Amino acid sequence: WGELEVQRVKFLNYLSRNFYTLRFLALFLAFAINFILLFYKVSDSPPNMVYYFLEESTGYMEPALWCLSLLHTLVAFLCIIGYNCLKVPLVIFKREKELARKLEFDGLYITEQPDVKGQWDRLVLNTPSFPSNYWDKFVKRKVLDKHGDIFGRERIAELLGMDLASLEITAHNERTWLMSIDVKYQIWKFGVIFTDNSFLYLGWYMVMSLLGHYNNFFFAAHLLDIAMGVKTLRTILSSVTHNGKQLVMTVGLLAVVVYLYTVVAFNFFRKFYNKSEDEDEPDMKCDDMMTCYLFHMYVGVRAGGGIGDEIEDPAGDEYELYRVVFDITFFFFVIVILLAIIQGLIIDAFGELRDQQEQVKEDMETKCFICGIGSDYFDTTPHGFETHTLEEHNLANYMFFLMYLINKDETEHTGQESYVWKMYQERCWDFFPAGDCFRKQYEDQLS
């Protein structure tokens, strides 16, 4: 069992270093099976309607599409197990980082009580494999030494799942692999992975690829990956939901205006509505109101010139001036304004979202991300802002300070490094400069 286990971690590691290459071939083969699908044909003749493939001087295309569909479902399943190998330890680590500081600092589950995320997280405090994917594992003794005097300590120990709290603490002071696994922790960890929006998109990608063997026309929806893949065409799709509250009421407003335009047409202008050009077989559409309201919202918002394009002309003397005012105020409202409100609502939503992606780049190229002085102060010396960025205030040096403080001992720290280390563990950020960086206070005494 030892050789099969190391062959499993060799296959899982070989796949995860090629995670970007594997999805490149997953999209290339996704576009390859939908390019060849353009040559389908329906016929009454055999090869009811049948779906047979047509090709000129090539008979290899039908075994190819059967080969690429099994190759796409295989490569999609390796992508799921790859995302279940690589980024799912990352997505738990940000949640048990936020909760373990939510438990100890402000006390989310000990002094107050709550959101579905607050009550789903109750299944993870009583497992002993709580800090298993976290750098801090003494978090439960942090909060019992903090809030174990104000309340009953036996109740908070039963809340925190600490097995033998008066015996394991004395044992730590002085001195069937699946059956050893916790069933409450893995049902909890499989619950939050299902909350993740990327995995339900990756889960939608695999469940439709396996549905593509039932009908090969189901491979069409994987070419909508170009909308979510590149960031250019995702701002077009996210602009619909960015201002989606304002759009659903305007189409709600357009629904009640057109329904108020059909009721006036149903009571006074009903003899005009007749699309049938045959005299003996008359089809008057304005006889039932649910029939006619479906007729208005299908041709009236599509014609561009109002409802009167599909209706006979008002050359008759009966209701000649009422109708000619009726179509004009209908054309002025639903197409000229309300349909220009909707395209007036998405394109500036599309316009503003790209304006905030360009201003993020511009303000980053101007301000310093750490201290509160612009790039106009550092214009006194040439290349002063790049000297202020790369050498003095760099975001990579602030991490490189941190992991250097992780690796070295507490008895090897100097006074400046032990001061920022004690200020970081109680989580206060007054050690950052924020508006002065060696060129405002010593500006007269350095030349």
Binding site: L90, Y398, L402, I406, G415, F438
Partner: protein
Amino acid sequence: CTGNQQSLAHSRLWDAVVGFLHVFAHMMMKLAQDSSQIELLKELLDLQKDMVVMLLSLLEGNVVNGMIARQMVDMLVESSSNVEMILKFFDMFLKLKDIVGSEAFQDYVTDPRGLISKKDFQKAMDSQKQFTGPEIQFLLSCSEADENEMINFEEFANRFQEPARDIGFNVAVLLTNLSEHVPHDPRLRNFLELAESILEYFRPYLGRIEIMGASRRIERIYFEISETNRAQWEMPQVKESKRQFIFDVVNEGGEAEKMELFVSFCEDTIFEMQIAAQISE
């Protein structure tokens, strides 16, 4: 503590450190002429490692014109002869791996076994203007003779890199700390041109960072970046999380909570390189 640093400045510590710099500069050019004297020379390089961090811990909380830095530099110009011998030591043995790394000097040797003679490598290093006349017979006297036909440039290069990595880094840190704290000094400007190579070699390994504490005074904090930490920093999976984190802070993130998000971004990247170091081949 301001009390001890004025007590060490008003004591006779300076003639002790000058005398310790005198015995260190002469023994390392005496103990480098034999291969059985390796244990004493590493123990000495760890000892002058301990003094320069003692000298760096004296310079903590130092004002841009303070008396600790000026009594540190006049101690250096009272003792010019030996600290030029320590920085010439760290120059000639760091330049040689850049010298033996050239395409010319590996083309001047044609032995298949790799044991080059002593006369051919002496005329080769004399052709380059980076090394001088009395320097090269010092380096062949420090090398293994082996009947004047085997110098073994590979083992002579990596011999004094590993014991002299830490001290060669910290005398570079001591010079850059004193230069940017007290400027407009010609004798310190004498010292950086004399030790230019140990600064440019340790520039991507030195990180300069500033924090603000101790009665609202900004100080410059100096630390080390190892080679493994920067090699995993410039990988595409790490910078793609960097590109989106910069985006979600200046666009929708707050002003006071942006440094709380920065440290939450920092601890996440320590973990994602740790899961990357676990999955590395």
